[PDB]
Design a protein around this ligand. Structure first.
Ligand SMILES: Nc1ncnc2c1ncn2[C@@H]1O[C@H](COS(=O)(=O)NC(=O)c2cccc(O)c2O)[C@@H](O)[C@H]1O
Ligand SMILES: [Ca+2]
Ligand SMILES: [Ca+2]
Length: 435
């Protein structure tokens, strides 16, 4: 009965964000429902040989949701999902969104240590993972859970064993008895994002349907997504950048197709790009340099590529200028954070803007302060700490009133710890970090 707790925006702000049409009060599933009504047979996912259409994606994720409700998981429950870059990730994500189950999506690279702490924190009634992952190689982690009574009622395994509840069987066939389910309401938590800004253990970021959906819709527009967009998805699927900036979700919103890739390794990606005439990709700087090393020898395989976003870590101008000359596609720079705020260079910005800056916020209403060691705004152009609040920036980590009071100010701006400067045209330049 009790929905997951989070820190809310003020009602003044809630109202403003509905008034400007940012918050339209639909569930994240809107992406899918709308997609089914316009183009049920367009490709939504390409994963090696497989092709999932929008209605295939809608049907399969309905199956699993009915199947989970049958076992009485729904509004109030939480779930821990750990899945590699395969179509099942999205099927599952939609399933839980439809079910009303608030999900935390673990990175596949996360090991016992992190999975344990997430479990302790959100106490899932559902766990989903892969028998091919070192942690579910055998049973030591699962049995371990029994001994602290953090055992999930239900556990699904991809690449399951015979005595496992297989994920694929739960996706493939709908439940015998019909139980009722819906999404969490739109101004309540849809799921948990994770910070990359953390010492060791990632802090949990509640995101609501309203704020996430808005970030996705607005991002699709800033990047000019449309139904011909075919977006390579080589970064970890649950990462905010890859999910929503504009991400799988952005592409789904625009009626395009996501193209799966296990990781960002060049030869494998280059030839996934070739096979599916991928026209859009998203990478972090260390992966950009790998592609840069092999692109001249494979000019032919990667021509179809029209846009590459780079975000996630400092990106020297030196390398930025190489993207168009070497990768043969437009560059867009992205500076975002799981916590909220995302900045894009625009497609109509100048050469210099795009090579030397990390763009400007999604929303005219992303409010921004750049401040000095004593919390005063700095002179324009100077370097200070970024502080921000907006229509899609969280208002606290899950169940951490102590850390929250350290990283928010009286007026509810959030402090990322990034050192920025505003440029004379209006974009941001990420210059550093501070504790
Ligand atoms: N373009 C950038 N240049 C320099 N630093 C960056 C940049 N982008 C992110 N960072 C650092 O990474 C931190 C954010 O870490 S996260 O993992 O939460 N998210 C992302 O990384 C993320 C990147 C691009 C688009 C997105 O939507 C994202 O969510 C920021 O506080 C920055 O310190
Ligand atoms: Ca199909
Ligand atoms: Ca090209």
């Amino acid at each position: 009965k009790q929905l997951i707790e989070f820190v809310r925006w003020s009602p003044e702000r809630a109202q403003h964000y509905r008034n400007k049409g940012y918050w339209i009060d639909q569930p994240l599933t809107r992406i899918l429902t709308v997609g089914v009504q316009s183009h049920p047979h367009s490709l939504a996912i390409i994963c090696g040989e497989r092709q999932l259409s929008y209605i295939e994606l809608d049907r399969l994720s309905t199956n699993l949701a009915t199947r989970l409700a049958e076992k009485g998981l729904g509004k109030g429950d939480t779930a821990l999902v750990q899945l590699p870059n395969v179509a099942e990730f999205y099927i599952v994500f939609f399933a839980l969104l439809k079910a009303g189950v608030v999900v935390l999506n673990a990175l596949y690279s996360h090991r016992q240590y992190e999975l344990n702490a997430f479990i302790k924190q959100i106490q899932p009634k559902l766990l989903i993972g892969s028998r091919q992952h070192e942690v579910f190689s055998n049973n030591q982690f699962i049995d371990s859970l029994h001994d602290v009574n953090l055992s999930p009622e239900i556990i699904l395994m991809l690449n399951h064993q015979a005595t496992d509840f297989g994920l694929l069987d739960w996706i493939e066939t709908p439940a015998e008895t019909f139980v009722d389910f819906s999404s969490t309401p739109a101004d309540e938590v849809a799921f948990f994002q994770l910070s990359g800004g953390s010492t060791g253990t990632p802090k949990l970021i509640p995101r609501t349907h309203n704020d996430y959906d808005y970030s996705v819709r607005a991002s699709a527009e800033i990047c000019g997504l449309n139904s011909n967009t075919r977006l390579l998805c080589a970064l970890p699927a649950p990462h905010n950048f890859m999910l929503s900036s504009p991400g799988a979700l952005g592409v789904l919103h625009a009626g395009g197709c996501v193209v799966m890739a296990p990781n960002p390794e060049p030869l494998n990606c280059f030839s996934i790009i070739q096979r599916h005439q991928v026209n859009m990709a998203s990478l972090v700087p260390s992966a950009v340099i790998m592609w840069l090393e092999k692109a001249a020898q494979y000019k032919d395989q990667i021509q179809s590529l029209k846009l590459l976003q780079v975000g996630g870590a400092s990106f020297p101008e030196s390398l930025a200028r190489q993207v168009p000359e070497v990768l043969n596609c437009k560059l867009q720079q992205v500076f975002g954070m799981a916590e909220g705020l995302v900045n894009y260079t625009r497609l109509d910005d100048s050469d210099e803007q795009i090579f030397t800056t990390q763009g400007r916020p999604i929303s005219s209403d992303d409010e921004i302060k750049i401040v000095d060691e004593q919390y005063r705004e700095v002179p324009e152009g100077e370097i200070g700490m970024l502080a921000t609040r907006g229509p899609y920036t969280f208002c606290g980590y899950y169940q951490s009133p102590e850390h929250n009071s350290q990283v928010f100010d009286e007026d509810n701006y959030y402090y990322s710890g990034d050192l920025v400067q505003r440029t004379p045209d209006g974009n941001l330049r990420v210059v550093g970090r501070i504790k």
